[PDB]
Each structure stands twice: as structure tokens, then as C-alpha cells.
Design a protein around this ligand. Structure first.
Ligand code: HEC
Ligand SMILES: [Cl-]
Ligand SMILES: [Cl-]
Ligand SMILES: [Cl-]
Ligand SMILES: [Cl-]
Ligand code: NA
Ligand code: NA
Ligand code: NA
Ligand code: NA
Length: 82
């Protein structure tokens, strides 16, 4: 799975198993993702592309296709509770 591979290589440092070791209240599990509206590929992809706060932008680091793939992976994992 490309999305999983991208996640392992670029996201798992902070978000292993859907957590967030940096910002406790902003993890990738169902509750926080739903509360914050990260419930579509597009919502997730927008964040990954642009960054926010202490999370880097990935729009000049990952391709559009890679961003879509990792965003779909995160969506599916979050909706099903990692
Ligand atoms: C640590 C250096 C991080 C890496 C690597 C990635 N993310 Fe991240 N993410 C981080 C922080 C500090 C935050 C909070 C941003 C804020 O201030 O609100 C986030 C948030 C997310 C979210 C939203 C989670 C939520 O609101 O509950 C998503 C969907 C997310 N991060 C995805 C994501 C992906 C796919 C990454 C790899 C490309 C990635 N993050 C890397 C910190 C860090
Ligand atoms: Cl794939
Ligand atoms: Cl990768
Ligand atoms: Cl933070
Ligand atoms: Cl950045
Ligand atoms: Na890997
Ligand atoms: Na913290
Ligand atoms: Na670049
Ligand atoms: Na940069």
C-alpha cells in the first residue's frame, strides 16, 4: 500500500499508530479527526499540503499523488480506529 508506505516514511515520526506525540489533542483517531472535520480525503490532503502550526507543509515535499494516497490511508485508518 503506497499510502501506508508514505505514512511510514513521512508521518509516523509524530503519528505512529494514529497518535500525535507533539499535540496530544490533535491525533489521527476517530474522535479528534471527527471533531476537527478531517473526515474526507480533501480535508486531510489540504492540511498535509499546507501544514499547520508545528506540522510542516508537505506540498513541496510529496507529490500531489502521494498526498492523495497518504490522505486516503489516514482517512480509512481514522474511520476504523487504527
Ligand atoms: C511531527 C513533526 C508531525 C509530522 C511528521 C506530521 N504531523 Fe500531522 N500533525 C502534527 C501536529 C503538531 C498537528 C497539529 C496541528 C495543529 O496545530 O492543529 C498535526 C495534525 C495532523 C492532522 C489533524 C489531526 C486532528 O486534527 O485531530 C492530520 C490529519 C495530520 N496531522 C496528518 C499528517 C500526515 C498525513 C503526515 C505525513 C505526511 C503528518 N501529519 C506528519 C505533527 C506532525
Ligand atoms: Cl498502492
Ligand atoms: Cl514514501
Ligand atoms: Cl503543537
Ligand atoms: Cl513548513
Ligand atoms: Na515502509
Ligand atoms: Na505535547
Ligand atoms: Na521540493
Ligand atoms: Na520549506
Amino acid at each position: 500500500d503506497q499510502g501506508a508506505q508514505i505514512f511510514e516514511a513521512h508521518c509516523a515520526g509524530c503519528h505512529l499508530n494514529g497518535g500525535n506525540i507533539v499535540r496530544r489533542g490533535k491525533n489521527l483517531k476517530k474522535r479528534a479527526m471527527a471533531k476537527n472535520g478531517y473526515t474526507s480525503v480533501e480535508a486531510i490532503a489540504n492540511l498535509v499540503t499546507q501544514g499547520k502550526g508545528n506540522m510542516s507543509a508537505y506540498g513541496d515535499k510529496l507529490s500531489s499523488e502521494e498526498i492523495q494516497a497518504v490522505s486516503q490511508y489516514v482517512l480509512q485508518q481514522s474511520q476504523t480506529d487504527w
